[PDB]
Design an enzyme around this catalytic site. Structure first.
Site, PDB file in Angstrom:
ATOM      1  N   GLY H  60       0.828  -1.185   0.000  1.00 16.03           N
ATOM      2  CA  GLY H  60       0.000   0.000   0.000  1.00 16.03           C
ATOM      3  C   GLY H  60       0.869   1.242   0.000  1.00 16.03           C
ATOM      4  O   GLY H  60       2.055   1.183  -0.332  1.00 16.03           O
ATOM      5  N   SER H  89       5.398  -5.973  -0.778  1.00 15.58           N
ATOM      6  CA  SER H  89       5.656  -4.526  -0.801  1.00 15.58           C
ATOM      7  C   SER H  89       5.907  -4.067   0.637  1.00 15.58           C
ATOM      8  O   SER H  89       6.680  -4.717   1.368  1.00 15.58           O
ATOM      9  CB  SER H  89       4.489  -3.854  -1.506  1.00 15.58           C
ATOM     10  OG  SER H  89       4.558  -2.445  -1.386  1.00 15.58           O
ATOM     11  N   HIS H 114      10.042  -5.494  -3.522  1.00 14.75           N
ATOM     12  CA  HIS H 114      10.215  -4.877  -4.828  1.00 14.75           C
ATOM     13  C   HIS H 114      10.472  -3.386  -4.650  1.00 14.75           C
ATOM     14  O   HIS H 114      10.085  -2.784  -3.649  1.00 14.75           O
ATOM     15  CB  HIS H 114       8.983  -5.157  -5.711  1.00 14.75           C
ATOM     16  CG  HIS H 114       7.802  -4.275  -5.436  1.00 14.75           C
ATOM     17  ND1 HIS H 114       7.345  -3.340  -6.339  1.00 14.75           N
ATOM     18  CD2 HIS H 114       6.989  -4.178  -4.359  1.00 14.75           C
ATOM     19  CE1 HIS H 114       6.301  -2.704  -5.831  1.00 14.75           C
ATOM     20  NE2 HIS H 114       6.067  -3.192  -4.627  1.00 14.75           N
ATOM     21  N   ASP H 163      10.364  -7.895  -9.012  1.00 12.78           N
ATOM     22  CA  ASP H 163       9.569  -8.495  -7.958  1.00 12.78           C
ATOM     23  C   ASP H 163      10.271  -9.770  -7.553  1.00 12.78           C
ATOM     24  O   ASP H 163      10.485 -10.650  -8.395  1.00 12.78           O
ATOM     25  CB  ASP H 163       8.158  -8.800  -8.440  1.00 12.78           C
ATOM     26  CG  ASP H 163       7.263  -7.585  -8.431  1.00 12.78           C
ATOM     27  OD1 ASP H 163       7.801  -6.488  -8.189  1.00 12.78           O
ATOM     28  OD2 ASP H 163       6.030  -7.722  -8.650  1.00 12.78           O
TER      29      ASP H 163
HETATM   30 BR   LIG Z   1       6.642  -0.475  -2.665  1.00 13.64          BR
END
Ligand SMILES: [Br-]
Ligand SMILES: O=C1C2=C(CCN(Cc3cccc(F)c3)C2)N2CCCN=C2N1Cc1ccc(C(F)(F)F)cc1
Ligand SMILES: O=C1C2=C(CCN(Cc3cccc(F)c3)C2)N2CCCN=C2N1Cc1ccc(C(F)(F)F)cc1
Ligand SMILES: O=C1C2=C(CCN(Cc3cccc(F)c3)C2)N2CCCN=C2N1Cc1ccc(C(F)(F)F)cc1
Ligand SMILES: O=C1C2=C(CCN(Cc3cccc(F)c3)C2)N2CCCN=C2N1Cc1ccc(C(F)(F)F)cc1
Ligand SMILES: O=C1C2=C(CCN(Cc3cccc(F)c3)C2)N2CCCN=C2N1Cc1ccc(C(F)(F)F)cc1
Ligand SMILES: O=C1C2=C(CCN(Cc3cccc(F)c3)C2)N2CCCN=C2N1Cc1ccc(C(F)(F)F)cc1
Ligand SMILES: O=C1C2=C(CCN(Cc3cccc(F)c3)C2)N2CCCN=C2N1Cc1ccc(C(F)(F)F)cc1
Ligand SMILES: O=C1C2=C(CCN(Cc3cccc(F)c3)C2)N2CCCN=C2N1Cc1ccc(C(F)(F)F)cc1
Ligand SMILES: O=C1C2=C(CCN(Cc3cccc(F)c3)C2)N2CCCN=C2N1Cc1ccc(C(F)(F)F)cc1
Ligand SMILES: [Br-]
Ligand SMILES: [Br-]
Ligand SMILES: [Br-]
Ligand SMILES: [Br-]
Ligand SMILES: [Br-]
Ligand SMILES: [Br-]
Ligand SMILES: [Br-]
Ligand SMILES: [Br-]
Ligand SMILES: [Br-]
Ligand SMILES: [Br-]
Lengths: 183, 184, 183, 184, 185, 184, 184, 185, 184
Positions: H60, H89, H114, H163
């Site tokens: 987020g 993330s 990532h 990723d």
């Molecule tokens: Br990020």
């Protein structure tokens, strides 16, 4: 959502005789504000009332409903401009009891003639336009009454949007005191 | 898919017979085409009569008044013919034909009313916009009174609301002169 | 249906009579076509007059000023004719015809007003855009005063809001010279 | 809708006079048409001057640089004429006309500014996209300094924001050579 | 809305008479068909006289571009490629697939090369198949770029992992084009 | 955003004072609530007056007549008060207060007009739908004539178009009884 | 769903500690709530310090200036704390904390930039809005200079475009006083 | 629509009584505020008793996550992070910012790291400013990941360019978490 | 709308009976609620069995694997009950119940299949995304083989496409242990 204090913060503001007229003005705000005013008068019709104004204006009929209620009740009304007071917001600001209308130092105040719209046959356009000029003279009269300015000066100042600072509004007659701190 | 007749399209052959079609809603684009047709037919002959077929529900007043002014300018006698319906500015154009040469087919409908419009903006702007539309009302009523030979009063009374007339009734009112089933 | 006239479409035949049509809203596409028509008629004859038929509600300002600059550049006299209505940039083009050859049909409408616009973005960008819209305001006013021979004060007064005029009133103001009902 | 004159369409007749129109927003499609007209006019004559009519609000930079490179490629003198407005890539093409042969009608507006763009994706992709448009800013500034004979400093100061000019204000900045009310 | 010149053609058909084919704008199956017909026609009028391809494209559908590519290599004529304005994605491929020594660019054009993008949805088997396809594609195009640039696959793999923007002069060094042209011969 | 008072909400506190709010457009829900409130107040006392605060632009006609029928049914004196605006059915309820006890604040606006509606479907359905809207026109005209003490002719003339009044004008017309600028 | 911790929801519990949350975009609705909390905490004690946690990307300028005027009005020391990010009006409220008591967590971001807006309508109106935006810029620039002790040139230069800062950079500029990795 | 348990709370307030804070779902400024209030409250009831963060998030808003991160490091309590289901993330950042030796994952969770993404629009100056900001951000987060993973920035730069998906056991080797938990102690 | 029974809401009363509902699509939000209910029921008793009612069409795999890991974490026996339908992640949670305590009502439908997903972007990103979901296919196949006691081959053959089963067809595949029409 709205914080509880000791009973939610907004009802706690009502106990200090403080009514908020923040945001756009429509019939819903008029209903709420008017009901708050009539309530405070029943608990004390002499102890002053504080109206905190931070509004961009709104529906004209709705504001004049609040206006008539300010003038109807017996209490002194202290108006306080916070953030912004534009269109009908500045009308409520100016209708405070003389010598009791205030502003915080960095506010903006703006007055202008009403707007509207008309659709339909020429006869209907004729009637609708008569109503908007009657409204324009009505609001103009109210501003001249509380600013103690001539209707003439009002006409010149309100033909377009006229923005004022707290001190400009004081000189024009919109408010009486500009406050940087408590007395 | 406009048909080609013997080397023309059916409408170009109609202009060749001195026939102007005012069908559909009226806007500046319709005005532009009709005005150019009238001025052209007058250059070919300013004496030979011109025939206008009207089947319009009305439209923009300025555009209609542009056609009106053009009808009055050119020297030719103009024969107007109401087909289907002639309302709003359509009924004005119909009545503006040369006296004695305004016609309608038996089952047509004719309608007149005061102009409509809209105003938006400050009260100052509304006053201005509203002054213009009452002036337009006085303009169109005056034109209608001229070609019906009626009183301005009757004009007003009738045009305050939508008044639909039959070909036969419009002939009494002064909008057209003749109701025709078959050629004389 | 553009009709075919005897081998000509009705609008190309109109161009053969030295008649240029400016009907409808004015944009860069309309400016392009009208300019090409003017330069062509000047190439057939740099002396024979050209006729401009105007039935416009206004439109893009730069496009209108492009046509205006062309009318003044070419050597021919240009007769302007208002049919139906000529408002905003339409009335400027109407008034830019050569003196004494600016006409109107009896029931046309002529209207003049100051320019409108929009600004968005940072405060610095708003400053730039408003300086530009003001320069345009002085630009169109100066052009209008030039062709009406009216004082810049009268133009400022007359164009602060919308002015609707009749053919005759326009003649008086200086926008057109002749009102006609018949040849 | 384009009028037909003798017998061609008015825009093909304008190409006969060695006039290329760069009006409207500039994208690769206008580049094809503009580039093809220039290369064609050179085969007719590599010496007879060519006239470009500019009334443009700008557009895609590569398309505009495509026309710029072609203007430079051909041998003919190019007369640029600003009509209405020449902003963003338009003012570049206007100023890229052959020295002493860059014109404007009296009431045009001319505008110059630095390019705008957009980048999306991972930070690494944003870094690439940001490098690519700083390269265009340096490229377009350089071209403007070259033909305006201005210093890159001036260009940098002037193009940081939208700078709108009058015809004579642009003559002075080096964007055009002549302001013309009427034919000399 | 195309101007008509000189026995009287439209400006684009007149360009085809000069043996000039425009691959300007985005590439889809329609552009592939039009360019292919133009190429086959010009070799039909002359299978030896050089053919000129004007490229000002941001790329487009990969199969469509490889369709044009295969035709360029097929016909017997030399193909002169000219980058005007911009050649990115497949546009730079067509630019570099010109006949050696006849690949050109105008001074202010931009050249950009990058690995293919795509999308896969559905069950896993399907995702797999699709990604395999995309990999085989990267490899194909990488090989083409190497063949025409004369660069090793290692340099290509490095150069095309991200968007690589070049100037005409940078494209000449890299091997995408041979000559940069400020004004005519 | 409803405040709490000492412990009820301000709106239940208003019902505590025998004050009913008719603010906003009038629809069937509004009617339901208003009717219930009125009946409750009658339950609590058959004599002590009931106060209606009216600030409405109109709304559904049947809904308004449902409230009207309730006002006339219950035995209490009903004090009507116009605040801000009372238009369409709002002005009807305002005028429907008990004689001598209908009020308005100084800057309110009052408006009366004939009903509007709509018809779609076969000609038979249009005839039926149109007969009903004339019946409401006669019904609403009769109700207004009753409480304004105006002749049906004067009502018919005044309500053919939108008729705006000020508090004083309304007092003269018969819609309200007193204009209050402050408490007695 | 906001948790209950004892019985209080966790946000009323934070108001109990004299902590006001100014998280999210700032509009008039946040302003009333922020102002009501500030005025309330002063009535509990006009001396015990108040802590504002700021994690805001900005919002309406007047609404923010409403909070600012309230911060300066009350007599309490106000501790500002930047959490996550404080940009646009957020950094102003942040910088408006009591001198010596303006804080940021180690990884926050701070941004200062000139106001943006929009004007529409006639040129006459455009002038008024453009004058109003210029006064706002000069007003906010004055406020930032007051609390950062920076000269008005530095403010004009730094806020012409978006200026992003780290806690240590914002400390130098005068926006905050302390950067804290842990409690002392 | 939250069940009520046992003096009677909702299941989420009962979890807060166990000193368990959920950072499940996407992260925005609202989640940051709620988590921050929960952290500050639990250190207020006890600034020494460990606090548990349940993480099941796909990431987020970056500022929101760094707001939670800064609070975790600020409070005096040990924070035990628990990856349930997924942490990608910023979710993996919060997972790795737990107190050393107390970072856990259930056996079938997925961890993904990532580099940040973003967007820039407007004039060139503006594009520049924005990209600089994004670069400084990559650097910040890279440094955080290194600090908590104990990996060199070189390994981080390599690992986060694209990723990078990991298994709990791979995350333990990489340095994001310390323990993988099949069934209880 | 949830009924209230004694005094709680019917779903809180069901949690009192040690019953957790996993009905509806499975996303991280259901995972929070399901996981919190399981960890809570274990603190009440780590030995009293827990019952999961499953009527689910599947959903997000990580959310489902979150529940799976939590089911395994707690010490209690878990009784799974398939009511209506258990497909995709639902049939995994159903089959992950404690051996011998996995149930289904007679008319349910049970379905198993390989995961689906999506990838977009550069080829290199697609390659990563494709690797990640082959890893899930191997992961979910493994879990299914573990609790069904089936071979991975069978799982692979059965889950290549949607395989719908009847309650008894699933008992035979190893997905559940008992099919119950009525209480034993
Ligand atoms: Br990020
Ligand atoms: O003020 C009045 C008013 C009336 C009827 C007149 N109307 C005039 C009016 C109407 C609308 C807007 C205005 F600006 C003024 C004022 N009546 C009648 C019922 C008993 N009381 C009252 N009162 C005291 C009262 C009110 C409300 C509360 C409440 F707070 F509980 F709601 C308590 C006490
Ligand atoms: O019939 C007429 C008609 C008129 C004027 C009257 N109007 C009356 C009318 C109008 C509309 C519907 C009707 F039921 C009757 C009939 N005029 C006048 C011009 C010369 N001719 C004619 N004609 C023959 C004619 C028509 C069209 C073509 C063409 F379309 F092929 F060109 C050739 C010849
Ligand atoms: O009627 C005129 C008119 C003018 C200039 C005045 N203007 C007055 C006017 C303008 C607009 C609407 C009106 F109601 C009246 C009438 N001029 C000037 C050029 C030579 N001719 C003319 N003509 C004959 C003419 C027309 C058109 C065709 C064509 F259709 F074939 F093109 C041929 C011949
Ligand atoms: O007027 C010119 C002009 C130029 C150079 C531009 N200059 C300036 C100008 C003035 C006003 C508005 C403008 F936008 C531009 C006008 N040049 C140069 C090439 C030969 N001729 C010309 N001509 C004659 C000419 C034009 C067009 C047609 C055609 F449209 F019929 F094709 C025939 C003849
Ligand atoms: O200018 C050239 C050019 C070439 C090939 C190079 N290229 C370089 C170039 C320069 C600037 C922008 C570009 F995009 C490309 C210029 N070639 C090759 C075929 C024969 N001719 C030519 N010509 C003359 C020519 C063109 C077109 C027409 C026609 F469009 F009218 F048909 C007639 C004559
Ligand atoms: O931690 C603090 C903090 C302050 C002011 C500084 N600030 C800095 C900070 C640090 C990390 C993240 C942030 F966003 C802000 C931390 N202050 C001031 C008021 C009295 N207490 C505190 N406390 C204890 C405290 C908090 C909350 C509850 C409650 F949630 F239970 F209400 C009780 C006790
Ligand atoms: O501060 C004031 C203020 C006034 C009127 C002046 N106004 C000035 C003002 C207005 C708006 C924004 C500002 F920045 C400053 C401040 N009045 C009047 C009523 C009694 N008290 C107060 N108080 C204490 C008070 C307030 C609210 C609560 C509440 F928590 F109940 F809401 C408790 C105590
Ligand atoms: O019926 C059961 C059932 C079980 C295990 C499931 N089994 C199978 C079943 C049958 C039909 C439809 C189904 F979906 C599931 C039914 N268990 C186990 C826990 C203690 N009790 C029970 N009960 C009594 C019970 C239920 C609910 C309430 C409450 F709703 F009031 F909370 C009170 C008592
Ligand atoms: O199970 C635990 C767990 C921890 C920390 C580890 N974690 C591991 C875990 C396992 C599976 C899924 C997960 F996401 C996390 C399990 N801790 C630490 C705080 C005190 N207790 C516990 N408990 C008992 C407990 C929980 C919740 C409630 C309540 F929700 F009812 F409040 C009461 C008692
Ligand atoms: Br107003
Ligand atoms: Br009409
Ligand atoms: Br204008
Ligand atoms: Br050149
Ligand atoms: Br640009
Ligand atoms: Br590609
Ligand atoms: Br009604
Ligand atoms: Br701002
Ligand atoms: Br288990
Ligand atoms: Br699945």
């Amino acid at each position: 959502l709205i914080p509880i204090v000791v009973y939610d913060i907004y009802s706690r503001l009502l106990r200090e005789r403080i009514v908020c007229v923040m945001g756009p003005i429509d019939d819903s705000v008029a209903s709420l504000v008017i009901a708050q005013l009539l309530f405070l008068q029943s608990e004390s019709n002499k102890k002053p009332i504080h109206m905190y104004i931070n509004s961009p204006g709104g529906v004209v009929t709705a504001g004049l409903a609040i206006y008539d209620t300010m003038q109807y009740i017996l209490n002194p009304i202290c108006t306080w401009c916070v953030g912004q007071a534009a269109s009908m917001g500045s009308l409520l600001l100016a209708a405070g009891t003389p010598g009791m209308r205030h502003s915080l130092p960095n506010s903006r105040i703006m007055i202008h003639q009403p707007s509207g719209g008309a659709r339909g046959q020429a006869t209907d356009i004729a009637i609708q336009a008569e109503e908007i000029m009657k409204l324009k003279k009505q609001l103009y009269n109210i501003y001249a009454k509380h600013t103690k300015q001539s209707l003439q000066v009002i006409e010149s100042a309100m033909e377009r949007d006229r923005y004022m600072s707290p001190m400009e509004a004081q000189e024009f007659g919109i408010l009486d005191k500009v406050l940087v701190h408590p007395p």
